[PDB]
Scaffold this active site. Structure first.
Site, PDB file in Angstrom:
ATOM      1  CG  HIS F 200      30.810  33.088 -68.427  1.00  0.00           C
ATOM      2  ND1 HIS F 200      30.937  31.825 -67.890  1.00  0.00           N
ATOM      3  CD2 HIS F 200      30.726  33.937 -67.378  1.00  0.00           C
ATOM      4  CE1 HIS F 200      30.923  31.909 -66.572  1.00  0.00           C
ATOM      5  NE2 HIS F 200      30.799  33.180 -66.237  1.00  0.00           N
ATOM      6  CB  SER F 204      39.483  38.926 -70.757  1.00  0.00           C
ATOM      7  OG  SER F 204      38.204  39.409 -70.397  1.00  0.00           O
ATOM      8  CE  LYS F 226      41.261  50.146 -64.893  1.00  0.00           C
ATOM      9  NZ  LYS F 226      42.695  50.064 -65.149  1.00  0.00           N
ATOM     10  CG  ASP F 227      34.362  48.473 -65.951  1.00  0.00           C
ATOM     11  OD1 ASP F 227      35.558  48.466 -66.222  1.00  0.00           O
ATOM     12  OD2 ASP F 227      33.724  47.541 -66.443  1.00  0.00           O
ATOM     13  CD  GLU F 270      24.016  60.656 -91.716  1.00  0.00           C
ATOM     14  OE1 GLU F 270      24.063  61.226 -92.825  1.00  0.00           O
ATOM     15  OE2 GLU F 270      23.080  59.897 -91.392  1.00  0.00           O
TER      16      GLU F 270
HETATM   17  C1  HEM Z   1      26.350  46.857 -79.620  1.00  0.00           C
HETATM   18  C2  HEM Z   1      27.553  46.408 -79.979  1.00  0.00           C
HETATM   19  C3  HEM Z   1      28.572  45.735 -79.025  1.00  0.00           C
HETATM   20  C4  HEM Z   1      28.548  45.566 -77.702  1.00  0.00           C
HETATM   21  C5  HEM Z   1      27.479  46.009 -76.691  1.00  0.00           C
HETATM   22  C6  HEM Z   1      29.750  44.874 -77.327  1.00  0.00           C
HETATM   23  C7  HEM Z   1      30.092  44.521 -76.054  1.00  0.00           C
HETATM   24  C8  HEM Z   1      31.205  43.839 -75.651  1.00  0.00           C
HETATM   25  C9  HEM Z   1      31.577  43.644 -74.289  1.00  0.00           C
HETATM   26  C10 HEM Z   1      30.802  44.165 -73.072  1.00  0.00           C
HETATM   27  C11 HEM Z   1      32.693  42.947 -74.243  1.00  0.00           C
HETATM   28  C12 HEM Z   1      33.321  42.593 -72.877  1.00  0.00           C
HETATM   29  C13 HEM Z   1      34.824  42.402 -72.922  1.00  0.00           C
HETATM   30  C14 HEM Z   1      35.480  43.735 -72.878  1.00  0.00           C
HETATM   31  O1  HEM Z   1      34.868  44.652 -72.306  1.00  0.00           O
HETATM   32  O2  HEM Z   1      36.598  43.882 -73.415  1.00  0.00           O
HETATM   33  C15 HEM Z   1      33.090  42.652 -75.621  1.00  0.00           C
HETATM   34  C16 HEM Z   1      34.174  41.932 -76.103  1.00  0.00           C
HETATM   35  C17 HEM Z   1      34.466  41.669 -77.434  1.00  0.00           C
HETATM   36  N1  HEM Z   1      33.772  42.194 -78.518  1.00  0.00           N
HETATM   37 FE1  HEM Z   1      32.050  43.343 -78.467  1.00  0.00          FE
HETATM   38  N2  HEM Z   1      30.491  44.619 -78.444  1.00  0.00           N
HETATM   39  C18 HEM Z   1      29.792  45.141 -79.503  1.00  0.00           C
HETATM   40  C19 HEM Z   1      30.196  45.096 -80.804  1.00  0.00           C
HETATM   41  C20 HEM Z   1      31.247  44.356 -81.265  1.00  0.00           C
HETATM   42  C21 HEM Z   1      31.714  44.345 -82.612  1.00  0.00           C
HETATM   43  C22 HEM Z   1      31.132  45.150 -83.780  1.00  0.00           C
HETATM   44  C23 HEM Z   1      32.734  43.518 -82.705  1.00  0.00           C
HETATM   45  C24 HEM Z   1      33.422  43.316 -84.055  1.00  0.00           C
HETATM   46  C25 HEM Z   1      34.350  42.401 -84.237  1.00  0.00           C
HETATM   47  C26 HEM Z   1      32.983  42.948 -81.390  1.00  0.00           C
HETATM   48  C27 HEM Z   1      33.941  42.035 -80.990  1.00  0.00           C
HETATM   49  C28 HEM Z   1      34.336  41.734 -79.694  1.00  0.00           C
HETATM   50  C29 HEM Z   1      35.435  40.883 -79.312  1.00  0.00           C
HETATM   51  C30 HEM Z   1      36.375  40.126 -80.262  1.00  0.00           C
HETATM   52  C31 HEM Z   1      35.526  40.845 -77.988  1.00  0.00           C
HETATM   53  C32 HEM Z   1      36.605  39.999 -77.285  1.00  0.00           C
HETATM   54  C33 HEM Z   1      37.201  40.658 -76.058  1.00  0.00           C
HETATM   55  C34 HEM Z   1      38.676  40.402 -75.896  1.00  0.00           C
HETATM   56  O3  HEM Z   1      39.467  40.500 -76.861  1.00  0.00           O
HETATM   57  O4  HEM Z   1      39.061  40.104 -74.753  1.00  0.00           O
HETATM   58  N3  HEM Z   1      32.044  43.495 -80.538  1.00  0.00           N
HETATM   59  N4  HEM Z   1      32.136  43.226 -76.445  1.00  0.00           N
END
Ligand code: HEM
Ligand SMILES: CCCCCCCC/C=C\CCCCCCCC(=O)OC[C@H](COP(=O)(O)OCCN)OC(=O)CCCCCCC/C=C\CCCCCCCC
Ligand code: HEC
Ligand code: HEM
Lengths: 241, 62, 64, 71, 49, 378, 106, 51, 54
Positions: F200, F204, F226-227, F270
């Site tokens: 935040h 993005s 859209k979500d 699995e």
């Molecule tokens: C329970 C697991 C996870 C949840 C709930 C989660 C959730 C989210 C959410 C809600 C966003 C909002 C931005 C979007 O929707 O694009 C986001 C962005 C992001 N997440 Fe996760 N994520 C998870 C696991 C991971 C993992 C394993 C990685 C591994 C690298 C990761 C890396 C990122 C990154 C780099 C962004 C940046 C968004 C962008 O490039 O604009 N997340 N994540």
């Protein structure tokens, strides 16, 4: 290093998509288990409370509880006495313990028949192809004193002795009691025992493909009429000369 | 000018939020009984017989 | 019984005769000398697979 | 980091239009179909060749395992 | 002070688990007969004598 | 005045998703984070009734499962949700992690490092769960792994007795595995409000690379409708699979009842651990194998420090586009190989396939990006 | 390093220019670079006529992508008409940073 | 790399290898007490904390 | 164990059977005889030092 034969695929009346289980092959399939299979195999998870509305009327199968009366446990001053049996009671198990089975059946514990359908590659067509298969031993293979030849079984030699042939049973209806049709009406009884859910859920998958149908092109319309302002905007750039 | 179906539709019960909210409640009520009847019927006809009802007439009124 | 009638009907097609021809050739050679190694379980396997494949399309029709 | 504090920008203009004054599908099957074309075209010259290889190895491997037992 | 209050928690749910006493110190002497390998539900994995 | 702005509580949700700048050209590959958010939330409401009626005892371990399927009202529905809503959870997670790499999203130091910790934590929760049902695969995975962490240089002997809470798998097993498989979800809904608090403060990314402050757009109503469309389309796929063909994914070896004695013929896991199992089995010896299995999760961390490029993302880069697709095609050859015996011809492909997972990441993407720099003069 | 092959380096550079696709959106090579702390400095050392242009080539080519289309073929940025506007301001922010760092070393 | 090359970072390294060495020593010895590590609890027979 | 004819013997085996369970049972039964001690003081004070105007 020995190869295994795979059962083919047959056209069952309950095969796919939307089609159900006809309750006559199942009505005529408990009896083939009852007067042949049971005296060795157990059905412990399966109880007489289940069949009140699938194959028989409530008192029609109630009367099958009096056919054999199970041994009971501790009651007053004279426990270990016998009770006629009622609606709740389970499929009576043959031996005192399963360890008696190796005593009489050559040290081969009989598989239980509650999940035998799901616990096998093949399914309800592996069992059927097992039954009619029994064949001749080829030239040059030895066997034990108490073993039989079957090209489907992975070891090619099973203890069990062919329990179905012509004129084994008398159907209550009069359909020709032949090996071909006794085998089919056993492969239908066991499947429904593996699942009691196979017919309730084919009906909740058709009343749901209709709620989605009505509601999944109406959210698409709202979404599309918010992004039109945003999708029809033109733009300038006249800078100062 | 010619009376469109939606022309008098928007005037009577679509204005404030109030009648916009009454019909949403009432609309489902006149909808669930029609939708329930015409959904089970196709289930029976597609494969009638096989089910338990279409044989239990063998056991009725003695 | 209805299966007993259809099995030889379904053995009529030539998809199953050829492997049947193969079974005998090794079968007599194996029994000719007690010194052979082959057990005809393999040549058995081709014959049952082809036969029981073609039985499948029909037998449920020729029931009751 | 809210809207009044993000950047500075000069001499440019925009020309919006209402949602209740227009239509949502101007041309649905006359634009979308030639659109999917140029897209996929431009790109399925560097996405397919990698996945042909996994198919060639897959058929070469089950063939060998089968003929080592069944002669 | 902060030593005992964690040393005890380390062993509360473990350190033979309090159900493991019976057959590691058991006095059975091979209830299995001669020449057979019968499985016992002790030692976690079946015990063989 | 304006109520949302001045209230002390509404003031927080207004800055988070009603009113924040968002980019114009965000695609549908940015919908998976919210799906995971939806995906995580089913699994806790389901998993509640599977312990409420659940009984933790050794003797009833096989029988408690088959019991709950038929006897319990509406139990046949809810049981196959827990097992099928957890194969969904792992297909919205290999899509999310893949997407970030393509568009250069790991240049957020704060958030790409809090995410690799979340990837180990959900692997563990899944691998206890397979071991609860107990039947003739839960037991015969448990021996394999549990045994092999006994090849630690100086501590491995002391650990297999604690987790067993006995000599080996025992009545206490329900007590602990349930105990640690119960705990894990609630640490994951804490590292997610921290994974998002570090984002935040930059906002993005977008599928172009370049930075776009000259046209932002609110977050309402443009990505909150859209979500919704996205999530509905998902309930549709998750429900074709449990009301028509539930059993398509599992293995028919699980059911065979609880026996220490019996021999499972064809052990294998699995479907979403079958690329791990092909690594461990590819190398001789106990101690070198466990090191090649932790290496992969630990390799994602060397990510930002291997970047050699003037541009961010692969959108404008043809040569580096092709490789992307190779790493992916070659993670489909480790899922096919791992679900079969070692084999006469399956050992040679089987351990050629693995190194390459390593060669490309550590040697060939850094070199190839330089020839692109040199070829348009930076 | 080669001379007789510099015709071939030109040949490969005209092919890689077209395969990458920023010209169908109107952009120029310097529009694509990644903005770190050293490229964020060399941007506020630009005159105003150069800085205003860059903010319209980046807003018209990030609207064509929201709509999944491309600009007409007569308006594609040619090869021999791309001018490197941000290059000279960037060699100077850098060589002033190697100087503040070999002072702390000696 | 080159931003960190010099004598001053090597001097800070040799200046704070006391910090790293004490940090690691305290961490290693604490990792013995925390997990009821008997295997180094015996290397000194002076802590008879095992009952 | 939420078994209507297994529930009472459960606590009876925990306050005998396992390591240190007799301590934990009693901390849980007594550590809320005092969480209810705290409440009557934290409340009665706010009716002394005018603390409701919040
Ligand atoms: C329970 C697991 C996870 C949840 C709930 C989660 C959730 C989210 C959410 C809600 C966003 C909002 C931005 C979007 O929707 O694009 C986001 C962005 C992001 N997440 Fe996760 N994520 C998870 C696991 C991971 C993992 C394993 C990685 C591994 C690298 C990761 C890396 C990122 C990154 C780099 C962004 C940046 C968004 C962008 O490039 O604009 N997340 N994540
Ligand atoms: C089966 C396995 C999954 C197969 C998915 C195949 C998807 C095929 C459709 C996507 C290809 C396509 O449509 O064209 C390429 C298309 C071009 O789009 P632009 O970004 O606009 O580029 C414009 C100019 N080049 O490429 C893309 O969209 C790529 C989108 C991101 C890929 C995300 C897919 C994730 C699959 C890879 C996962 C493997 C890594 C997992 C890491 C886990 C580590 C333990
Ligand atoms: C007491 C004799 C006996 C009779 C009669 C009998 N069973 Fe069997 N059943 C067994 C034994 C013994 C086995 C296999 C035990 C073993 O191989 O270790 C077995 C196996 C089976 C199997 C699985 C076969 C396999 O290959 O695993 C089924 C299904 C079964 N019984 C049900 C039946 C049915 C159906 C019938 C009537 C056709 C029947 N039983 C009659 C004792 C019997
Ligand atoms: C990411 C989250 C989770 C994943 C991936 C997951 C996965 C699994 C899997 C694969 C099984 C196998 C059981 C089967 O095959 O039917 C299982 C069983 C089980 N899980 Fe989870 N689970 C998750 C969260 C939870 C939570 C929050 C609970 C809370 C109590 C829980 C409790 C259980 C229980 C009690 C079983 C019992 C075994 C059974 O009934 O079959 N799980 N889980």
């Amino acid at each position: 290093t020995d190869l295994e034969l795979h059962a083919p695929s047959y056209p069952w009346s309950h095969r796919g998509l939307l089609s159900s289980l006809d309750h006559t092959s199942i009505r005529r399939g408990f009896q083939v288990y009852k007067q042949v299979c049971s005296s060795c195999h157990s059905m412990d998870y399966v109880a007489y409370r289940h069949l009140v509305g699938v194959c028989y009327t409530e008192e029609e199968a109630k009367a099958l509880a009096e056919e054999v009366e199970v041994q009971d446990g501790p009651n007053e001053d004279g426990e270990m006495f016998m009770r006629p049996g009622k609606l709740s009671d389970y499929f009576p198990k043959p031996y005192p313990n399963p360890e008696a089975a190796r005593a009489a059946n050559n040290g081969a514990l009989p598989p239980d028949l509650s999940y035998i359908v799901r616990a096998r590659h093949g399914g309800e067509d592996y069992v059927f192809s097992l039954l009619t298969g029994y064949c001749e031993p080829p030239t040059g293979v030895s066997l034990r004193e108490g073993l039989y030849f079957n090209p489907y079984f992975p070891g090619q030699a099973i203890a069990m002795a062919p329990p179905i042939y012509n004129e084994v049973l008398e159907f209550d209806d009069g359909t020709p009691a032949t090996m071909s049709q006794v085998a089919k009406d056993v492969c239908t009884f066991l499947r429904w025992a593996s699942e009691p859910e196979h017919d309730h859920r084919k009906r909740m998958g058709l009343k749901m493909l209709m709620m989605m149908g009505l509601l999944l092109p109406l959210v698409y319309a709202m979404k599309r009429h918010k992004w039109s302002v945003l999708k029809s905007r033109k733009l300038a750039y006249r800078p100062p000369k | 000018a010619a009376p469109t179906l939606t022309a008098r539709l928007y005037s009577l019960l679509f204005r404030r939020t109030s009648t916009f909210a009454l019909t949403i409640a009432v609309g489902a009520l006149f909808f669930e009984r029609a939708f329930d009847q015409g959904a089970d019927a196709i289930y029976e006809h597609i494969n009638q017989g096989k089910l338990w009802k279409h044989i239990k007439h063998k056991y009725e009124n003695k | 019984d209805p299966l007993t009638t259809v099995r030889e009907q379904c053995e009529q097609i030539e998809k199953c005769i050829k492997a049947r021809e193969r079974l005998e050739l090794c079968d007599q050679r194996v029994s000719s000398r007690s010194q052979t190694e082959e057990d005809c379980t393999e040549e058995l396997f081709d014959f049952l697979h082809a036969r029981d494949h073609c039985v499948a399309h029909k037998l449920f029709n020729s029931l009751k | 980091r809210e809207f009044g504090h993000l950047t500075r920008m000069r001499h440019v203009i925009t020309y919006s239009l209402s949602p209740f004054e227009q239509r949502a599908f101007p041309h649905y099957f006359t634009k979308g179909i030639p659109n999917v074309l140029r897209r996929t075209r431009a790109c399925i010259l560097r996405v397919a060749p990698p996945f042909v290889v996994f198919y060639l190895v897959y058929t070469w491997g089950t063939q060998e395992f089968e003929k080592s037992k069944r002669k | 002070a902060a030593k005992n209050a964690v040393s005890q928690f380390v062993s509360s749910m473990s350190a033979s688990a309090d159900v493991l006493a019976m057959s590691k110190i058991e006095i059975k002497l091979s209830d299995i007969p001669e020449g057979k390998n019968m499985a016992f539900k002790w030692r976690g994995k079946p015990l063989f004598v | 005045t304006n109520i949302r702005k001045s209230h002390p509580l509404m003031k927080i949700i207004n800055n988070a998703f009603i009113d924040l700048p968002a980019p114009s050209n965000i695609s549908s590959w940015w919908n998976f984070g919210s799906l995971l958010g939806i995906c995580l939330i089913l699994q806790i409401l389901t998993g509640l009734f599977l312990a409420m009626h659940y009984t933790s005892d050794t003797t009833t371990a096989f029988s408690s499962v088959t019991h709950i399927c038929r006897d319990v009202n509406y139990g046949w529905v809810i049981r196959y949700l827990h097992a099928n809503g957890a194969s969904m959870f792992f297909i919205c997670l290999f899509i999310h992690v893949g997407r970030g790499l393509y568009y250069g999203s790991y240049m957020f130091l704060e958030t790409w490092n809090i995410g690799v910790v979340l990837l180990f934590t959900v692997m563990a929760t899944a691998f206890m769960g397979y071991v609860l049902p107990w039947g003739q695969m839960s037991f015969w995975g448990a021996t394999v792994i549990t045994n092999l962490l006994s090849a630690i240089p100086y501590i491995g002997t002391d650990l297999v007795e604690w987790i067993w809470g006995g000599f080996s798998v025992d009545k206490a097993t329900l007590t602990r595995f349930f105990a640690f498989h119960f705990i894990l979800p609630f640490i994951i809904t804490a590292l997610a409000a921290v994974h998002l608090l570090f984002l935040h403060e930059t906002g993005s990314n977008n599928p172009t690379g370049i930075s776009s402050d000259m046209d932002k757009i609110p977050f309402h109503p443009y990505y909150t409708i859209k979500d919704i469309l996205g999530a509905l389309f998902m309930m549709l796929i998750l429900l074709i699979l449990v009301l028509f063909s539930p059993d398509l994914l599992g293995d028919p070896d699980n059911y065979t009842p609880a026996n220490p004695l019996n021999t499972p013929p064809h052990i294998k896991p699995e479907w979403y651990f079958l690329f791990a199992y092909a690594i461990l089995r590819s190398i001789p010896n106990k101690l070198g194998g466990v090191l090649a299995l932790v290496a992969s999760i630990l390799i994602l961390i060397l990510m930002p420090m291997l970047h050699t490029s003037k541009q961010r993302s692969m959108m404008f880069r043809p040569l580096s586009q092709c490789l992307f697709w190779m790493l992916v095609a070659d993670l489909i050859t480790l899922t096919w190989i791992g679900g079969q015996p070692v084999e006469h011809p399956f050992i040679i492909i089987g351990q050629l396939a693995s190194i390459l997972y390593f060669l490309i990441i550590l040697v060939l993407m850094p070199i190839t990006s330089i020839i692109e720099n040199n070829l348009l003069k930076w | 390093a080669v001379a007789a092959s510099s015709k071939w380096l030109e040949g490969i550079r005209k092919w890689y220019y077209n395969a990458a696709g920023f010209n169908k959106l109107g952009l120029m090579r310097d529009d694509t670079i990644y903005e770190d702390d050293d490229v964020k400095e060399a941007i506020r050392r630009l005159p105003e006529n150069l800085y205003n242009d860059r903010v319209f080539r980046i807003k018209r080519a990030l609207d064509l992508t929201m709509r999944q289309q491309i600009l007409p073929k007569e308006q594609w940025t040619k090869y021999e008409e791309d001018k490197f506007y941000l290059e000279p301001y960037l060699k100077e922010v850098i060589r002033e940073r190697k100087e503040r760092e070999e002072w702390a070393k000696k | 790399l080159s931003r960190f090359l010099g004598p001053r970072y090597r001097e800070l390294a040799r200046n704070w290898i006391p910090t790293a060495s004490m940090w690691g020593a305290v961490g290693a010895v604490g990792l013995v007490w925390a997990t009821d590590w008997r295997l180094i609890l015996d290397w000194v027979p002076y802590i008879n904390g095992k009952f």
